[PDB]
Design a protein around this ligand. Structure first.
Ligand SMILES: O=C(O)CC[C@H](NCC(=O)[C@@H](O)[C@H](O)[C@H](O)CO)C(=O)O
Ligand SMILES: [Cl-]
Length: 493
């Protein structure tokens, strides 16, 4: 049968295939095909209850949950002839993942004191203090992916373009700004993939990607957040549409240190002229939902009563006049050209005019935009993301003062939020389910009332596949909100 898969994504190019840096949906998707981790989510699940053995066959923890020991499978081979995956590779990968100079995700691993290779198949992880879930940090997402020490040392700066994993697919070549050619890893420990090749194509323009999928040029295509796309794609019986967990939350992160937004009244005015319920209704309720807090709704610790500011543009105009702006405010936002973020920025632009805001949009290619926002080049950041569904992840990365832009510990705190540090830190080490949740809720209320970030809608991942393609499992979720392609993915006869 057919063994070559063609896939079209809303992206211009590959930025990095080093999993300690892969941040864009497209880079994270490619990284999920190439690498594995000590533990993994079950294929087709984005649910932490599915976390199971991957490179690590089994594990043990002590009673205080500070010392974790992992027993590695002995049969796991690296791609590109780097031999067996050893405890030394895990030590190197995790030491790199927890280093802010060699990883974008070091903050997640702050509690790790040391990572030791007890023997060639045994890894011991020692924590300084308790974490909500150590297994979460070691799963096949963000900094959890394992890389070879020897391959990274040899390739250095080229590793991001010539990745080496133990996953079911390997990168054969990159055609910059066009595609990534992946081939089956014949030595994959769970068995040889049914697919021989993946042609992963950069087709950012939605109308062009839709034409390529309709003609049969693509077997898989990324969709958008519009219910019209969903309806059109379902109408043709040769297609299957997938709405994938987790939902990515979009927020307007306001830099609270920059005038005019250093006055809480101006931030409140903006929050009162945004209409998240209207965005969800306009886009479609099956894929989109307004979120009554600053973290995604599927998070453990989510606050449905965080106190989100209501739609009242008459109050926005009154607050602006009180702040010394009787004829409104003009704001210039550096906006991503990822089509979903672009259309969302345009809906916000129309909405905020009601409350006296003239929002100007400076469009920039998605990956370049990712680095500009991380240099404080935008007064407001329209950012979309899902994290491991424990409140600590989203809260720390986006709203803890250590994560603010300009610090060596920076993550994605574009707002420069510093009002919930105590609550975030306290919740991390609290083991009681209810007490931990209360601290997370307190943090959400403080972030909302300070108007550090304005929540909009969260969106499930939307993809279309041809009938002939089988994922090899039921696809409910995948941590990057993009389909997972494994050794089980195949074309039907
Ligand atoms: O993980 C991250 O830090 C960022 C992931 C992020 N993923 C894209 C994303 O969230 C989009 O789906 C937007 O929510 C959507 O297009 C807005 O309508 C990105 O590539 O920007
Ligand atoms: Cl991208």
């Amino acid at each position: 049968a057919k063994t070559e898969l063609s896939m079209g994504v809303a992206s211009e190019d590959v930025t990095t295939l080093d999993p300690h840096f892969a941040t864009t949906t497209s880079d994270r998707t490619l990284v999920s095909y190439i690498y594995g981790a000590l533990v993994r989510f079950a294929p087709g699940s984005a649910n932490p209850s599915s976390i199971e053995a991957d490179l690590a066959e089994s594990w043990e923890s002590n009673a205080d949950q500070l010392v974790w020991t992992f027993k590695l499978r002995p049969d796991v081979k690296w791609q590109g002839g780097y031999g067996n995956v050893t405890a030394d590779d895990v030590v190197f990968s995790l030491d790199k993942a927890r280093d802010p100079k060699r990883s974008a995700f070091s903050g997640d691993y702050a509690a790790i004191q040391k990572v030791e290779a007890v023997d060639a198949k045994t890894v011991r992880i020692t924590l300084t203090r308790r974490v909500p879930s150590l297994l979460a940090l070691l799963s096949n997402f963000s900094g959890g992916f394992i890389i070879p020490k020897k391959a990274f040392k040899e390739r250095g700066d080229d590793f991001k373009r010539r990745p080496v994993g133990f996953g079911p697919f390997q990168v054969e070549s990159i055609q910059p700004g066009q595609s990534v050619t992946l081939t089956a890893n014949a030595e994959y420990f769970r068995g040889k993939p049914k697919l021989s090749k993946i042609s992963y194509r950069f087709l950012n323009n939605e109308a062009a990607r839709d034409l390529a999928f309709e003609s049969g040029e693509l077997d898989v295509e990324q969709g958008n957040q519009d219910q019209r796309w969903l309806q059109r794609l379902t109408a043709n019986p040769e297609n299957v549409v997938d709405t994938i967990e987790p939902a990515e939350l979009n927020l307007l992160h306001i830099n609270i240190t920059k005038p005019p937004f250093n006055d809480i009244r101006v931030r409140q005015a903006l929050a009162h002229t945004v209409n998240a319920a209207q965005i969800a209704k306009y886009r479609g309720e099956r894929v989109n939902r307004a979120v009554p807090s600053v973290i995604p709704s599927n998070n453990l610790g989510f606050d449905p009563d965080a106190g989100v500011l209501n739609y009242d543009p008459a109050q926005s105009k009154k607050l602006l006049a009180e702040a010394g702006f009787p004829n409104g405010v003009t704001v210039t936002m550096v906006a991503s050209q990822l089509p979903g973020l672009e259309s969302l920025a345009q809906l916000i632009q129309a909405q905020v005019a009601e409350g006296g805001f003239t929002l100007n949009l400076q469009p920039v290619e998605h990956a370049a935009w990712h680095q500009m926002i991380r240099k404080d080049l935008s007064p407001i950041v329209l950012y979309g993301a899902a994290r491991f569904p424990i409140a600590d992840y989203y809260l720390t990365q986006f709203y803890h003062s250590a994560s603010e832009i300009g610090k060596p510990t920076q993550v994605v705190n574009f707002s420069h939020c510093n009002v919930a540090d105590k609550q975030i830190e306290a919740a991390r080490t609290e083991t009681d389910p209810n007490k931990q949740i209360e601290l997370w809720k307190e943090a959400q209320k403080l972030i909302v009332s300070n108007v550090c970030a304005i929540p909009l809608t969260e969106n499930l991942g939307t993809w279309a596949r041809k009938n002939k393609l089988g994922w090899g499992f039921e696809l409910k979720g995948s941590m990057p909100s993009a389909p997972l392609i494994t050794e089980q993915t195949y074309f039907k006869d």
